[PDB]
């Protein structure tokens, strides 16, 4: 049923309130989602001034319901099946030799808009680290992420590592532990094991005078044969 809501192009609103080592900030994002092509186009603004962390560390936090699930795997799309009531997405993100993010989000429909509302807390970061020091390159490599179900919580989980590019050419790992639980009571599809493949293009708007990120993202599911 919830799959019906994603047959067309859907407007997206993202709202994040963050706090990293006492440095508070807010991000607002708007764009559109095209789940038929697994395509996502967004622009994000730091509405409080200067973003105190690098934009690439926030990409995974800032709507997997827009992944392209092939016909052979619609009976396993948890993210759309929990719609329109939506789901809670929680994550811990451990940055190698540095601090952690802990995030809680609700993803749901508000009217005709898909809304992702996030609270983020950053803890134990080094003011000389790559994060608070803004020592990361402005990009994000393509990644694969393995999705498994947790029938004992009526949800799904995922663990995956992001390899962030550092300005000196080194790589800094960001280990993601993710849990999704539906907001409503109704039944949801729990899936067999599968993968989501993601490609990300980060860019800038030359007329934008605020701290910002333009994002083009493709997410496609695979790993189950009919």
Ordered by where they begin, the domains of the chain are 2-219 (2.40.155.10)
User: Beta partners for 177?
Assistant: 92, 159
In degrees, rounded to 5, the angle at the alpha carbon of residue 125 between the alpha carbons of residues 91 and 132 is 105
Please name the method used to determine this structure. Answer: X-ray
Structure tokens at 189: 């599809």
CB distance 116 to 88 below 8 Å: no
Å resolution of this model? 1.7
Q: How many CB atoms are located within 10 Å of the residue 86 CB?
A: 23
Measured in whole angstroms, how far is the alpha carbon of residue 3 from the centre of its chain?
20
Distance CA 190, CA 188 (A): 6
Q: What is the DSSP letter of 127?
A: T
Distance CA 179, CA 207 (A): 38
Locate the DSSP E strands across the chain: 9-20, 23-34, 39-46, 87-95, 100-110, 113-123, 143-150, 155-165, 171-182, 194-203, 212-222
Distance CA 46, CA 58 (A): 12
Radius of gyration of the chain (CA): 17
Identify the three-state secondary structure at position 187: coil
Q: What is the dihedral of CA 53, 29, 25, 173, to 10 degrees?
A: -30
């Amino acid at each position: 049923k919830g799959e019906e809501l994603f047959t067309g192009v859907v407007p997206i609103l993202v709202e994040l309130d963050g706090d990293v080592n006492g440095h508070k900030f807010s991000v607002r994002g708007e764009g559109e989602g095209d789940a038929t092509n697994g395509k996502l186009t967004m622009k994000f603004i730091c509405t409080t001034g200067k973003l105190p962390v690098p934009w690439p560390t926030l990409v995974t936090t800032l709507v997997l319901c827009f992944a392209r699930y092939p016909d052979h795997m619609k009976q396993h799309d948890f993210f759309k099946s929990a719609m329109p009531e939506g789901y809670v997405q929680e994550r811990t993100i451990s940055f190698e030799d540095d601090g952690y993010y802990k995030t809680r989000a609700e993803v749901k429909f508000e009217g005709d808009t898909l809304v992702n509302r996030i609270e983020l807390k950053g803890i134990d970061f080094k003011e000389d680290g790559n994060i608070l020091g803004h020592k990361l390159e402005y990009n994000l490599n393509s990644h694969n992420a393995y999705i498994t179900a947790d029938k004992q919580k009526n949800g799904i989980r995922s663990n995956f590592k992001i390899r962030l590019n550092v300005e000196d050419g080194s790589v800094q790992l960001a280990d993601h532990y993710q849990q999704n639980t539906p907001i409503g009571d109704g039944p949801v599809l729990l899936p067999d094991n599968h993968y989501l493949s993601t490609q990300n293009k980060l860019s800038k708007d030359p007329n934008e005078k605020r701290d910002h990120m333009v994002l083009l993202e493709f997410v496609t599911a695979s790993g189950i044969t009919l």
